Write a protein that binds this ligand. Sequence first.
Ligand code: NA
Ligand code: NA
Ligand code: NA
Ligand code: NA
Ligand code: NA
Ligand code: NA
Ligand code: NA
Ligand code: NA
Lengths: 209, 209, 209
Amino acid sequence: MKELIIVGAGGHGNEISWLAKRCGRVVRGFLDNTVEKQGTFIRDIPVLGTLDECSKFTDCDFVIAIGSPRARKKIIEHFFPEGEFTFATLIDPTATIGENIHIEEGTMICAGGILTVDVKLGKHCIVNTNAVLSHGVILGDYVTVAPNASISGDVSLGNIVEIGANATIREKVSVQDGAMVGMGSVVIRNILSNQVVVGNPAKLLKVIE
Amino acid sequence: MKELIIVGAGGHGNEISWLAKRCGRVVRGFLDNTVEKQGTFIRDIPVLGTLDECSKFTDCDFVIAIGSPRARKKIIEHFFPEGEFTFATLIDPTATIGENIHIEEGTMICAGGILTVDVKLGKHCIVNTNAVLSHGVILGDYVTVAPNASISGDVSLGNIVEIGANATIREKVSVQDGAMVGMGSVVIRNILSNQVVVGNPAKLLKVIE
Amino acid sequence: MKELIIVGAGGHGNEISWLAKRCGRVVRGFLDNTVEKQGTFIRDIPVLGTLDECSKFTDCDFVIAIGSPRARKKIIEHFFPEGEFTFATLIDPTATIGENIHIEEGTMICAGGILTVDVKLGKHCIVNTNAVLSHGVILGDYVTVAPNASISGDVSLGNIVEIGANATIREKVSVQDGAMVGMGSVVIRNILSNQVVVGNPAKLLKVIE
Ligand code: NA
Ligand code: NA
Ligand code: NA
Ligand code: NA
Ligand code: NA
Ligand code: NA
Ligand code: NA
Ligand code: NA
């Protein structure tokens, strides 16, 4: 397979370099805009330069290993014009991927994640450690599902949605584009665009836009 | 082994047909009373007819793949007189079944479920995806444990109990017959018969009967 | 390897005898101070005597299979003077141990636990069933992490901390020595020494000392 460039050398990039190694991929290096990270390494993998160096690595697959949905969308739209680059899809060997699962490119399915049946993910999604997506779940593009999230049957998550760690979503709930569910939330009602909800049961905290 | 008939062609039946395939079982088909589902399929497995056709398949094992505890009890008592039918016990290959685990027939233990030591389940139980039953847990008949439920040591769940997704039950709690714990609940007190409790900490919402 | 002595023949000792068997270890027996447990067994493994018999088994590895952090510290300081005894480190075969994970002796990592990258544990820790410790997590000595706990990146847990079942800790939170997080808590703020916090979001309940 192509060597991999990981965009983002933070905590998620750290864990995605681990995922890539477990997937048998050779990581060429990271791109990252942080001044303090130039000339640094994670486990023998160098930070190669800033994101505008991506054009020097068109021979590589990319992945955008940054948790923020809006960060991944911003980076793809600025640095990765349609058709110019290829993206990896990384699925941990300990993830369970069942039947009629469709995953678009750039997606990361991490250790212990479970996608059962009839699940559809858009591009550049994250399903983090030990999260569960049950029957009929649909994710748009740039969705982040944090560790231990519990997403019941027939849930729909719009584009640039973030589901926080160990949150629980009732079956048949819809979450509109850009919303965010706080860690630990218990979501029993539909969520509107750009809403942040928190708590048990989840209630509106604020709007992100 | 015998071919399997799955009663219920809904979301749970979808996931239990997946479980059966992962268990190496041949699924003859589903029985389901929904008019709109007659002549339909899930992943090449047909809906054969309504539940009163069960008598045409006594050569098959059955499983009642319906989440509602009371639905499974109703169906067994009406359609499955004692001794006339055999029931499968389906344990996902990725479930962990430890030592001195006793599971009665009709039970479904799904992907990533963990039953550690000295756990006892009655007939027609569900332990859904990634749920954990720790030391000394006892379940009656027709218990449903939803995905990611966290059932601590020495918990007793009566007949026709339902524990919702990603709920947490304190060690040594007893839950009487027919009760239901909402998704995400934090249960730190005993629960009486037919009570619905929700929240953190769990409190009485209403009675189911 | 050396035969193992398990200190504590309660619920945790039950599950740790299971862990030891899954790890290929021969358990010589338990030590336990309970009068009613003298002459008893768990799955063919005898309670050998009280903790003051430890000096008769210096040929064995020990593990202190008691959930209470303060119980493990008390027992080590009274019965196990520095250098006189050796301690096992038990890691379930179904635990995922990633890269740059450092675990000190006496630690138990149970079934389905996940430690991703750059995680450090002190002595006599417990990571119970299906718990997740993400990038950069640090635990002191005698930390207990209960089943299904969700500990996000860069969390620091002091000595003798207990994190209850299915609790969730926000990234970069620090928990000072001796604190306890109730089961199911949603921890979004730093915790001070000896504080007990509960709820969603977690709030101070009381002080343990
Ligand atoms: Na699309
Ligand atoms: Na798991
Ligand atoms: Na779309
Ligand atoms: Na019984
Ligand atoms: Na009974
Ligand atoms: Na959980
Ligand atoms: Na230390
Ligand atoms: Na120290």
